[PDB]
């Protein structure tokens, strides 16, 4: 049997930042192999669970040789034998075996790094790209045309960032591009343009873990006004050529005291006054709604609070008929959760993190619900990558017409991006970059496309 | 037949720091594939596009047009094993004696490819293909890697006033591949905490080190010290230090002296005191490996500054690595001169720098008849391409450098010297102290 699996064992191995993580390696027996690893974020509440060991004497806590053992001692002896080809019924297997919604037992990292080696494993059998085997055999699509990913992160603040601005991510998005290729022209030229213009302001231009940049920057506006001037300095219009994308992740200044949106690093450092900084959620909206108007912002990544559901369908209903809202950590790439998103029409667009959820399988099932919702699905790396480029395929297999995998530095980011270069140029006219119209979830201003 | 080549084409990809570098596919008739992409750092010429209009001017559309309409071609129907001759093809199809007219870039990609394609066709490691197939070394046991690791930046492209340019650690008490990941993995955490108690920023360099405002070298080297005892290990003989000096960039050849030159323009350091003759730079590095556990230097002292090369190798060289880098620029011709005169102990081997696969190893090579060890290097600009890898393994250099703990272009190299570990279980051998054959390390340092 060209497809039944002969070996599988896993073993740890590092991501981008120097943590610990899983590699799972899938042997078939017609020699075929498929190799995968996890990446890892920088801890939710529904996500997953990562497994770490917790040992302080080895990697400060972060060892993943249990999950690791979880592989080799628990999962692999069920698994030998399977057709590798037979994904969704070796991701029921792994999920029954844990037994826990939240795959507590054998770790959202061990069970994910087979559920893809399996697929990398087969594909190679079947000597086809894994874009392809992900389309034509996971999915059953019959796809021979593909939709290449718009990318969106150059500036970075919020709870890891080492700057007084509160937002987390600021993301450049190339939708006037028509090829992958120039998508990634215009990024690289407008993160190089960038570059100077913060190492001329005497800001520092060391990375941070997604290859942007973490200014000494004052406030948000400050940013997104330096992200225009990139634009431009690069050649580029600001909003047709290349728009601008938030982050947010506003639940991690959501004051649940008060039920406001405290913008605490600009307080603590006494750029904001308190009071006027201290946002109820309809001023939140607000504010975001003006930054959208002020700047060429096409999405917005967790405005409010995971917490503040209420908030969220009022600010879908706002924007979101021109913006795209797009929910993460609201639904943690959860598909009984992406359901009560659609039912209350909470956001217009998911995040898909595949070990927030922990199979391939399951990952599907969450892109098919945002697909019947007319939500857009942007398939999404981790502040810990590895050179890892399944996202990349994943993201042309399924159509979605969009990726969040970081900057134009450090090749765990990089590596995606030559990823889906090499489909795009595999592909050829069977490739197709749509820029603007990769949304179908929204309708954007024709203002803002030009 | 097997290894016929079938086809070959070049395409633009980015490299880590998100400039434009070459990937080279190369297919064979039976079907398997090999893909390789190039790094970007008496060089041999890396071929750039100078337009103005794309990518401020260094594209690389020229280099991968030579590969598609000038090296393909001439490829095409050949035995993707036969390396030495596809390599002479291509050094001869270019006809100068630096790449010019190709582009070392566009060479390398394709000489790259070759082998990774043959290797695939072998169905063989990429090491075991490269040790037993290219260099026929006739092996099943191989040496693991002894990383450097390049924590602290200074020098030319560091925006600090530490004029040294790169400051390793290196784990040489493991007995291990893994647990040497593990010594630096915590390592470089611990000093991750401690500069961020220091107020210093913790975002990272090309390399994936940091590059914090210090004010000296023995700041950087005091602060990697303390990481390694905070991490729970011992200086010297379980994690020492190696040193990038990069003395090319701050020698002043008007008046033969290793000037400090950014520690003097932030008046750091006083100008006379700190502008050293030959004589005063070896005293220098000499003091520094008294008091920090310094095992190796690069470039200590000037490309230009071949007598002082000779006379460090002959004072510290007994005890101490004395590595040339651009001193060769990984030039069998050139590394022939370093023997001969004793230039060093140790060469920098960089692909890139020469261009092919084959005139990489004859450098090797050289340095092995010579009893230098080999130091196989990455560039500050890689990608996720993982051959300096299974090429370190390959020659058993057991010794090299390809970053810190962060960043997957350096990390996708350590995952791959796993992999490697794993795979072959008793034939892996992880030396630690007794890597290196081309120094006897002071027993005080490595006890």
Same mark, same amino acid.
């Given at each position: 049997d060209l497809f039944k699996i002969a070996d599988l064992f896993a073993y740890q191995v590092f991501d981008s930042r120097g943590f610990p993580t899983?590699?799972?390696?899938?042997?078939?027996?017609?020699?075929?192999?498929?190799?995968?690893?996890?990446?890892?974020?920088?801890?939710?509440?529904?996500?997953?669970?990562?497994?770490?060991?917790?040992?302080?004497?080895?990697y400060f806590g972060k060892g993943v040789s249990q999950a690791v053992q979880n592989v080799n001692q628990t999962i692999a002896p069920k698994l030998i034998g399977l057709n590798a080809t037979d994904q969704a019924a070796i991701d029921a297997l792994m999920i029954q075996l844990d037994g826990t919604p939240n795959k507590a037992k054998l770790g959202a990292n061990a069970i994910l790094a087979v559920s893809l080696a399996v697929a990398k494993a087969a594909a190679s059998a079947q000597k086809t790209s894994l874009f392809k085997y992900l389309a034509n055999q996971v999915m059953g699509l019959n796809k021979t045309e593909f939709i290449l990913t718009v990318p969106m992160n150059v500036i970075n603040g919020g709870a890891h960032?080492?700057?007084?601005?509160?937002?987390?991510?600021f993301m450049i998005m190339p939708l006037g591009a028509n090829s992958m290729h120039q998508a990634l022209k215009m990024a690289s030229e407008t993160f190089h343009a960038l570059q100077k213009l913060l190492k001329q302001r005497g800001l520092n231009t060391n990375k941070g873990d997604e290859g942007g940049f973490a200014p000494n920057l004052k406030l948000?506006?400050?940013?997104?006004?330096?992200?225009?001037?990139?634009? $431009? #300095?690069?050649?580029?219009?600001?909003?047709?050529?290349?728009?601008?994308?938030?982050?947010?992740?506003?639940? =991690?200044?959501? +004051?649940?005291?008060?039920?406001r949106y405290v913008f605490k690093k600009g307080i603590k450092a006494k750029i904001l006054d308190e009071k006027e900084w201290s946002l109820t959620t309809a001023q939140m909206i607000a504010y975001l709604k003006k930054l959208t108007e002020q700047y060429p912002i096409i999405?917005?990544?967790?405005?409010?609070?995971?917490?503040?559901?209420?908030?969220?369908?009022?600010?879908?209903?706002?924007?979101?008929?021109?913006?795209?809202?797009?929910?993460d950590d609201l639904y943690c790439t959860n598909p009984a959760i992406a359901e009560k998103g659609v039912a209350h029409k909470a956001t217009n667009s998911i995040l898909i993190k595949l070990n927030q959820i922990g199979t391939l399988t399951e990952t599907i $099932? #969450?892109?098919?619900?945002?697909?019947?919702?007319?939500?857009?699905?942007?398939?999404?790396?981790?502040?810990? =990558?590895?050179? +890892?480029?399944?996202?990349?395929?994943?993201?042309?297999?399924?159509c979605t017409g969009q990726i969040k995998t970081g900057s134009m530095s450090r090749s765990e980011r990089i590596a995606k991006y030559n990823r889906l270069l090499q489909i795009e140029l595999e592909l050829g006219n069977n490739a197709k970059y749509l820029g603007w119209n990769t949304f179908k979830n929204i309708k954007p201003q024709k203002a803002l496309e030009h």
């Open positions: 899983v590699a799972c390696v899938v042997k078939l027996a017609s020699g075929h192999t498929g190799e995968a690893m996890v990446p890892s974020g920088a801890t939710g509440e529904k996500e997953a669970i990562e497994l770490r060991d917790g040992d302080p004497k080895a960032a080492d700057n007084n601005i509160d937002f987390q991510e948000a506006e400050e940013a997104l006004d330096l992200m225009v001037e990139a634009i $431009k #300095a690069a050649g580029y219009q600001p909003g047709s050529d290349i728009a601008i994308a938030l982050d947010v992740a506003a639940s =991690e200044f959501y +004051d649940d005291t008060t039920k999405s917005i990544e967790d405005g409010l609070s995971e917490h503040d559901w209420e908030g969220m369908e009022t600010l879908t209903k706002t924007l979101g008929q021109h913006i795209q809202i797009v929910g $099932k #969450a892109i098919n619900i945002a697909k019947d919702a007319n939500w857009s699905q942007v398939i999404s790396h981790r502040s810990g =990558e590895t050179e +890892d480029t399944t996202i990349a395929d994943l993201a042309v297999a399924a």
